[PDB]
A and B are shown apart, each in its own frame.
Chain A
C-alpha cells in the first residue's frame, strides 16, 4: 500500500476538496466522527482505502489532506462543518489577506510568507507514509491563491519530493460564475510555471459543469454547491482505482503511463454519464452511457474531439457492468463515431469496472443510477480551451490592461510574454499531433 496526499489550494480547491472527502466517507462507510465500522484492523492496516485515510489508535480515519488558503473564511467552514472531526487542526492552513485575484500577489508577495509553513505541514503527513506515491492538487486557474500559490507550491514539491508524481485538478475559468476580469492572466501565468512540474492535470471548465447542471439537473441558476457535487463525482471516479481493489490506474504513475505519452500534453479530457435529476427514470444501459461519452454536452470541457486525434483512452465504469457489454457497445460506437487515433498509438481502450454503483450525497441533486462511466481521453481537441484562453489574454495584454497590478507586486512584465510564448508553443504542439 502506497499513500497519496491531497492538497487543496484556494476557495475552489478547498470547497471542491470538502465535497470529495464527503463523498469518500460515504463510499467507504466512514462516519463524520472518523469511525469506520467495516474496518476491523483498528489503528492500522494497509488496505486500499488507507492510501487516502490514516488511522489513529482510537479508530479515527483521518484523511491524508492539507487545506491551504490565504483567507480564513472558507477553511473555517471545514473547521465547523459536518466532517470537522475528520481533520486535525494542523491540516488546515489559513492566512489573513488573500491574493485579491492577483497571481503575483499569491505567488510572490503573500505566498512567500506562508510557503515554508505549508511545506512543513505537508512534511508531517509525508512522515506517516511508508511509501508515498505523490500528491493530488486541487485549485482554480482564475483565483489569486489557486493560481499564484499553487505554482509556487508545485515548484517546491518538485524540489523536496523530486521522485513523487503530481496530479492536478484544475478549474478553468468561466464568466458565468467568474469573479475577476484578470482570470485569463492568472490561468496562463500559473500554467506556464506549473507545466513542467505536473505529470497529469484534469481540467474542469465551469462553463461545462454549469450547463450540465442546468440541462440535466434542471437547476435554473446552479451554485458552487451544485457544481462541486457533480465535480466530486468525476473526481471520485478518477481516484476510485487508488482507493478500491483493482488492476487499472492502481498508482499515480499509471495515470501518466496510460494517459500521457508526451509529457507536455498531459491534460486528458473527462466525460461523464449519466447525470440524472433526483427530482425526476429509465435506467440507461451500458451501450447508452458509453455512447454518451462521445457527446460534447457531457464533457468537462466543451470541445469537439471529432476534429482532433486521440493518444489514449480509459473507460472507468461503476455499477452493474460486465466486460461483454462494454465490448459490444464499443464495436457499435466505432461504426458510427469519428474516433481518430494518432498513427504512433494503438486504437484501443483501457477499461476498468468497479461493481459498486456510484454513491450520491443524500438530499443531493444527482439521482442514484445502476451504472455510470467516466471516460479519460487524451484528445488534441482540448487545445480549444487553450485557444480561447490565449485569445482573451492577447486582447487585454495588447493594451497592457491590469498589468500594473502584477508589476506592483514585484513581477516583471516580461513574465507575461514569457508565459504567453509558452502557451503559443503548447498550442503548436497540439496542432502538430492532431492536425495533418
Chain B
C-alpha cells in the first residue's frame, strides 16, 4: 500500500495519474502536508526538494527534476545552448537567439544588432520575433527598433523568425509539433509515440498574428476558421504522416521524427550531470513538452521546452497510464507506448 500526496491541483496530467493510482487499490492519497509519502506530485514553483529523501524507511519519488528550469525557460534555454559545449553556439537545430534585458534593469543587445545589420545589408530575410516566459505578449517585426522598444515597455528573448515554414495543404497554413517526453528515475528517455500538430486555421501571410501563432487558445479566440480542417486545430501523427506520403512522398519518421528524437536526446543528455538523481537520497522523474517548427525544407527547429505541459484530450488516458507504468510502478511495483531513446549515461 503505497502513499502519495498532491500539491498541484491545477495539473490536468497528474490529476488523471492520481485518479489512476487510486483506481489500482494499492495507492493511498494523503494530505498535501503529510511527510510520510512515497510519491509527491509537487507544485510548479518553489518545490521543497531539500525536504525530500529524509524520511527513514521510505523510498520517495517526485514528479519533477530539480534544476530542469534551465531547459524550460526562454532565457535559460538560450544561455544553455550557447554556453554548453555539447550544444555550442554553432547549433544547427536551434534558431539564432539572443537574450535582451529591458533598459529599466549578461545582456546581448549589441551582439543582436551586429547580426541584424548583416542581414539588412545582405538583402536576406531580417524578420525576428520577441517573446518571454511571462506571456500568455509576442511582437513580430522586421525592424529592430520596434523589438527593442517593445521589450522595455521582465526579460525577453529575440530569435530569428522562420520566414519559410512548412505549410499544410489545403489551407496554406502554419503549424507546430508538440512531443511529450518522459524521463524516469534512471534517466531513460521515453518519447510518447503519439504527437499532435497545433495547426493554424488561417492562411499564412508573409506581408495580424492569427496565422503566425499556432496557440490553441489564440486559434479558438481570434481565428474565424477554428475547427474547419481538423477538430480543434489538432492534427495527430496518423493524419500528418499520410499527408506527407501523399504530398511530399515521404514518411513522418524519416522527414521529421528522426530530427526530433535527435534534438530531445541532445538537450536532456546535456543537462544530465546537473539534474540526475542516480546517487541522490530521493528520485525524480518528469514529463516534458517539446515544441518544434518545421520549415519548407523538412528541417526541424526547436522552439521551447515546457516543464509542466498539458496533453491532448484524446491522448490523456494513454499517456497518463504510461506515466504510472514506467515512471511510478517502476519504482513502486504493483501486485509499449513509448520509444526509448538509448544513450550513454
Contacts and interface: CB of A to CB of B under 8 A. Distances in A.
- So, do A and B actually touch in the complex, CB under 8 Å? yes
Interface of A: 175-176, 207, 295-297, 302-304, 306-307, 336-338, 383-384, 387-388, 391
25 contacts: A176-B56, A207-B54, A296-B279, A296-B280, A297-B279, A297-B281, A302-B53, A302-B281, A303-B50, A304-B49, A304-B280, A306-B274, A307-B66, A337-B273, A338-B273, A338-B274, A383-B50, A384-B49, A387-B48, A387-B50, A387-B51, A388-B51, A388-B54, A391-B48, A391-B51
A384 B67 contact: no
Contacts of A387: 48, 50-51
Contacts of A384: 49-51
* Interface SS, B side: loop
Nearest to A388: B51
A338 B48 CA distance: 21
A306 B56 CA distance: 24
A175 B55 CA distance: 9
A175 B35 CA distance: 14
Nearest to B67: A307
Contacts of B51: 384, 387-388, 391
Interface in B170-190: none
Q: When A and B form their complex, which 3 residue pairs have the shortest distance between CB atoms, in order from nearest? A: A384-B50, A338-B274, A387-B50
B268 to A, nearest CB: 15
Contacts of B275: 306
A384 B279 CA distance: 17
B208 to A, nearest CB: 38
B47 to A, nearest CB: 12
A175 B279 contact: no
Given A304-B280, A391-B51, A175 B66 contact: no
B71 to A, nearest CB: 14
A296 B53 CA distance: 12
Contacts of B280: 296, 304
A295 B279 contact: yes
Interface in B255-292: 273-275, 279-281
A176 B56 CA distance: 7
A388 B50 contact: yes
Contacts of A337: 273
A176 B57 CA distance: 10
Interface in B35-73: 48-51, 53-54, 56, 66-67
Contact of B66 (A296, A304, A336): A304
A306 B70 CA distance: 13
B273 A302 contact: no
Contacts of A388: 50-51, 54
Contact of A296 (B48, B49, B281): B281
Contacts of A383: 50
Given A304-B49, A306-B67, A307-B66, 12 more contacts: A207-B54, A295-B279, A296-B279, A296-B281, A297-B279, A307-B49, A384-B50, A384-B51, A387-B50, A388-B54, A391-B48, A391-B51
A158 to B, nearest CB: 31
A42 B41 CA distance: 68
Contacts of A303: 50
A305 to B, nearest CB: 11
Contacts of B48: 387, 391
A306 B49 CA distance: 13
A292 to B, nearest CB: 10
A388 B279 CA distance: 20
A117 to B, nearest CB: 39
A98 B279 CA distance: 41
Nearest to A386: B50
A336 B274 CA distance: 9
A302 B56 contact: no
Contacts of B54: 207, 302, 388
Given A307-B67, A388-B51, A391-B51, A336 B273 contact: yes
A257 B56 CA distance: 37
Contacts of A306: 67, 274-275
A384 B48 CA distance: 9
Contacts of A207: 54, 56
A184 B90 CA distance: 52
Contacts of B273: 336-338
B60 to A, nearest CB: 12
Nearest to A436: B76
A388 B35 CA distance: 11
A312 B56 CA distance: 32
Contacts of B281: 296-297, 302
A297 B279 CA distance: 7
A296 B50 CA distance: 13
A256 to B, nearest CB: 26
Contacts of A391: 48, 51
B56 A175 contact: yes
A207 B57 CA distance: 12
A429 to B, nearest CB: 16
Contacts of A302: 53-54, 281
A117 B271 CA distance: 58
A276 B252 CA distance: 54
Contacts of A336: 273
Nearest to B57: A176
A383 B49 CA distance: 12
A307 B271 CA distance: 13
A383 B273 CA distance: 22
A387 B56 CA distance: 18
A297 B282 CA distance: 11
Nearest to A295: B279
B80 to A, nearest CB: 12
B33 to A, nearest CB: 9
Interface string B14-51: 00000000000000000000000000000000001111
